[model samples]
Target: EFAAVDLGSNSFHMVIARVVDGAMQIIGRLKQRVHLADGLGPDNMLSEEAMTRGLNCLSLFAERLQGFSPASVCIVGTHTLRQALNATDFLKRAEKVIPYPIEIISGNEEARLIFMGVEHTQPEKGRKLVIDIGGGSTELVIGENFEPILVESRRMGCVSFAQLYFPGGVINKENFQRARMAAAQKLETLTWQFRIQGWNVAMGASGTIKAAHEVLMEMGEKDGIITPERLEKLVKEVLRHRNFASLSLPGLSEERKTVFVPGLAILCGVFDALAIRELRLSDGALREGVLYEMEGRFRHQDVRSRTASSLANQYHIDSEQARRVLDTTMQMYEQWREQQPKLAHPQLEALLRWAAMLHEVGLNINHSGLHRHSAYILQNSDLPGFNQEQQLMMATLVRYHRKAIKLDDLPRFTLFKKKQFLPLIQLLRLGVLLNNQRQATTTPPTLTLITDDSHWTLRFPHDWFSQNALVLLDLEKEQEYWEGVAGWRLKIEEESTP
Candidate 1:
């Protein structure tokens, strides 16, 4: 069985499924209307009230997740967590209730996963424009057959828009227009790009769209098509109540009433800017995407490796040189792992390997300060399977792969400690330095990396450094670089002990 937990801005959702005869069979689904976005103050800190609600919800989820394998469950936090100033505090508390690592994905990655959820659940189509309007963010993606061509996430969401436009809890024409116009203004930045890469079919997922579809159905609309005209009609109907205190609409849940108008306004913006004629609702969304991705990994078809390989190709990387660096880096990492078994982490080696493959990516721009360029690309690029922290780790590894390691430049990571990541950077630099010649035939001599608290000793075969004076020169310089920046001693010696 597999489980996916989505810590959404407005709600928390969990889906548990099992594969029977190669098809996903969902066994359980859970959702809680936490409205996490409501807790965000103007100062960008999540209020204690909001965190409490979220944590209480997680406690219940933890009950269901008990005894599940760590690898079988994937939890992700969305827009609210991304903006919260005290997100680390909240994450630490939440970790006690739920032990799984919660990935706070970037808006683009959220958009991609939403698109994937729609694609894997729906029938085949040409190109698709997928939209998901959450409490704190709106994700719009254009894709075909599980491949996203263009993806954009706007900062305006139902929860935030409601607070901005519909003040005093009053529902009126001017406020509605102002809200819609504001959303349209935000959409203006990406309208041209999305218009150019048009879609054959349009789909909506998650809370707002689902509620809109249901409310439309309740209004005697036989077809479940969402159009600007329909949106205008809905806005008019909303005005009947005049205020949220007495708001009521058929098929609209009590929890959704306050947020409905803002979501509708954003939807209005989407329809008008993109000229969307018809949009159907999808039952599957981000959590479903998480499940399918997990299944893919179970089958040994990891999208991360594919993403790295594609990046290597797109950047015109030297495949032979990358291979040489990757081979040497992994060899050293494996030996070090055996010596320092306590430091062994499953994901560390893979990240180091990718850093080795991409360490020289900046060479495409210029030889000078290529490490900075490589790090910039890794940090900014749309890597599909990588979350923000994973991407940061890759960027950090490549950033310090060759140059002087600046401890201050490295970002603090929740997933990996500085101690673990710093060493990987060290190993990547050694791998690159050993293959400095970019030799097609030569391989680095067999060596053992013995790791200590503040010291790393490299043992090489007798007279190997003498034969490879250039490598010795590079290692000596690396010694200075490590000692100066990282405060670690690097000892390179010929193996004279048994």
Candidate 2:
């Protein structure tokens, strides 16, 4: 069985399931109202109370997560972590007790995963727009079946809007109008684009919208579905109630009362903005997406691999040279994989192998600052199947592959609390340095990473360095660059050619 945990902005959720014959059978589910995004102050720091609440909830979740192998688990943090200034500190502590590692996915990635999760739960055809309203963010995705054409994540959600407009559970017309306007403003950027792409069906996922649907059905409005007229009626009813204490909507959970008004406001704005006529509900979201992705990896149909190949094709990289580098790089990776804990992960291997294949992609644009161009392409291009952080790591590897490595180039990534960046960069740097010439004739040399941390010792056959003068020169230059720019020392020694 595989487990997926979504440490969301508003809640912490866990899904335990097993995939049989391409179908996922859910076994267990757990959820808690962490309200993580509610803890964000104006300065974007998570308050102590919020952190303690989240950690305590996670501690409880850790018990259920026991006995699951690291490979069989996927844990992801969403918008709350994205906004928290002290998220790294919180994550470090959380990781120590959790059975699996946690990944903070980007907004676009969240949208993508939401779509994947929703699509898996519903019928597999037709163009559909999927909406997920969480505590701090809302993800909108338009796609057909499993392919998402447009994905967007807005910064408004139930918790943030509730805190802003309905503090103390007092909801009024003016507050509702202001909240809807704020949501509309966030939707303004995508209104025209989404309208142009228009889907045949609209779907809602997660607790907020599901609860909204349930309430609508109880109020005798259009069979628990969201339609334009039904939505308008719901909004009017919300404005009429004006206070949660007086509201008696059936199916509205006590815990959800605080955020229901704001959640409905956001939904109303989306319905009006997109001219959505009817909305369906899906049981899947981020956790289901995590499970699907884990299953894909086990089946060797990993999307990340496909994404790298697509990037290579789009940039017109020399396939032969890329393959050669990949072969030599994988050889080196296997040799040293046992020594590096980070490298032991399959995800790390995938990253390194793909980076090697597409390292020289920037050559398609220009040779000057090719590394920088590569980085820009990676950062800006919408390469399918890659999340924000994965794109950032790939960009960093390309940017620092041959040129001077600068710590400042990746400050945004460093802001997050994680230890994998430096070592991953080191591996990419070494792979690119060893394959500088991109020649098939170049054979793997005897190179050893000597130091426990960052430095390495590269031993070459005697007279081999002299025979391959250009390669030796490049290695020397690489050694200097690593030391001067990345603060790593390298020692090169030569022995008799085999």
Candidate 3:
């Protein structure tokens, strides 16, 4: 069994499912309209009221997640967290309420997961366009079969739009006329490219569009598809009312009334920008995508593996040398876990191994300060299948793989506590140093590392460490760096070559 929680901007959603024979059978689901983005202040901080509300909801979900393995349950935050200036602080509070740590994903990564969820849940055919409207961001995708060709996540959504154009709950034609135009402007760049590469059938997911389609269906449309002509009627009817609170439409829910108009306005803008004629709604969403992502990870078909491979191959990283670093890093990690089982985290190993693979990619740009360049690209670029936090972990590990380690030099997005990851960093630092020669190893290098919470011992053949002067010197410098940062100990242990 696997579980996924989507801490969406509009609503927090949870899904518990069983992955059987490579497909997910959803067994449980929960939703709450926290509307987190609406509580964001101009200072780029999430208000306390919103944080409290979201935390309470998470506590409830956390109860149901008891007995679930940490690796089997994945929780992710969306646009709201991405924009929150105090997100790190909020995340700490949130982690206290939830069993697992939260992963705040980037917009493009959200779009990719949306595609994954929609494709698996609906099992569609042909090239289709999918749009997911949330509280703080809107994702648009054009895909065929199960793969997305183009993805765009604009930074405009229902909650912000409502707070912007419909302040004080007031509404009218003049406001909407101005509102739709302003809202549509955000999507101009995507319009031309999407139109050029058109989709066969348009589809939408989540609350906003679903509510709109429901209202349209009740308005005597024999078919349930939302169309431009129907939206015009809906727009006129909404404008006739004094405010969102007064509307008593056929299918509008009390929960949806406040956000309906703004959602409608944003949808209207998308319709106008792309000249969309009709749309179909889907029940699948980010939560379902989370399930699929977990399944892929379990099956060893992880997209991140492909992403990591592509990045390394693109930079012309020496695979043989990279493999040696990974092998040795694991060699040390495995021996440590065998000696100390409580210190292992599967996900942490994956992060460190991938970082080791790409550590030398900086050599592609320039040999000088290449670690900085590698970190810059990975931290700032669009890497598929990786959330912002994951990117930073790899970047930080690779950034400090060489040179004197400095935690302050890491990017602002790094989420790991220095105390927790100092050992892993030390492991990689030593792994790279031990393989400093970077030659293709005929067999696994005859190396061994004995590590504990705050100590490491690298043992080699007796006096073999003396034969390799450069490697020995590098290890000593690495020892100094590790000791300086973590105040721990790193010893070059030796044994006779028996």
Candidate 4:
């Protein structure tokens, strides 16, 4: 059995499931309203009260999560953590109490995962547009089968929007107008992009959409599907009531009343923007996505591997050269995995391997500032199976591959906790340095890495280093780079040559 935990902006959810005959069957489900987004102050700091509420909920969840192997549980934090200034600190505390590591995925990654979950649950055919409205963010994705062509996560959602435009349960034409306009502004960014790659079917997932669908069904609407006319009528009714406390709709729950206005406005804006006719609901969402991804790893259909291959193909990378780099990188990684201990973490290993394979991809665009070119391509491109942090790490690695590491590069990695940055960066940098030449013509170098907590030494064959002056120069420069940025000395000793 595997478990997936979604630490969302509005709520924390857990789904426990087992794969039976290649299909995931649910065993247990739990959800609690934590309202992590509600506690955000103007400074973007999560208030102590809010953190406590979320932590308390997770504490309860820890009981249910007991006895499950850490590998079998995927705990992800979403928009709330994405926007918070002290998210790393918050995550540190959460990780200590929880058995599994918590990953905060980027908005685009959230969109991809949502689509993955939705596609897995339904019959696979035709292009479909999927929308998921959470507490702090909303994701829209258009895909056919399992491939999403267009994916965007807008910066408007139930809790955040409600706090902004519909405070104190006030529901009026002006408030609704402002909320809709705000959502429209967010949608504006993706308007032309989505229209250019339109979808054949529209689908909605998660609490806000599901609740809206349920209410529409109670109002005798057609099968909980949202249509333009029905949506317009609901808006009119909200305006007619003029106050959230006095107004009651079929599917609108008491807890949801505060945010319903903003949620409805955002949904209405989507309907208007996309010209969506009939919108259906999906039982699958982020938590289900986590379950499916876990299953994919176990089934030997690991998406991360696919992500690396896609990157290589997109950039027209030399397949043979990439394989050669990967071979050497893995050999080095395996040798250090046990000794370094930190290198054994699955996510870290995956990042190192992927970065090594894609280190030279920037050469496709231009040779000068090739690392920058590579980083630009990685950050802007819609890479399948890669989340925001993964993309950022890849971009950072590529950019730092051969250049002078800078302070500006530091912020890109601030998304991760302090302890995680050095090792990950070192691993990527070392991997790139090992394959600096990019030509698979020469025999692999004999290299040994010895390290302590703060320093490392690389011993090489004496004649080989003397013969390969270029390689020695590269290593010397790399040693200076690592010492400057990583606060570690990289000593090189040349032994006998082959």
Top-scoring candidate (lDDT): 1
Error of 2 at 485 (Å): 6.2
User: Roughly what TM-score does model 4 have, to 2 decimal places?
Assistant: 0.88
> Which candidate ranks first by TM-score, i.e. highest?
1
Off by over 4 Å in 3: 20-23, 410-416, 440-445, 452-455, 465-467, 479-483, 486-489, 493-498
Give Cα distance to truth, residue 495, candidate 2, Å: 3.6
Candidate 4, residues 361-396, lDDT tens digits: the string is 888889898878887887777776665677777776
Question: Which lDDT tens digits does candidate 3 get at residues 320-351?
Answer: 88898888887877777677665666766788
lDDT of each: 0.87, 0.79, 0.83, 0.78
Model 2, 362: alpha-carbon shift in Å? 3.5
Residue pairs of candidate 3 with colliding backbone atoms: none
Residue 347 of model 4 has an lDDT of: 69
Candidate 1 TM-score, true structure as reference: 0.96
User: What is the Cα-based TM-score of model 3?
Assistant: 0.91
Off by over 4 Å in 1: 485-487, 496-498
What's model 3's overall lDDT? 0.83
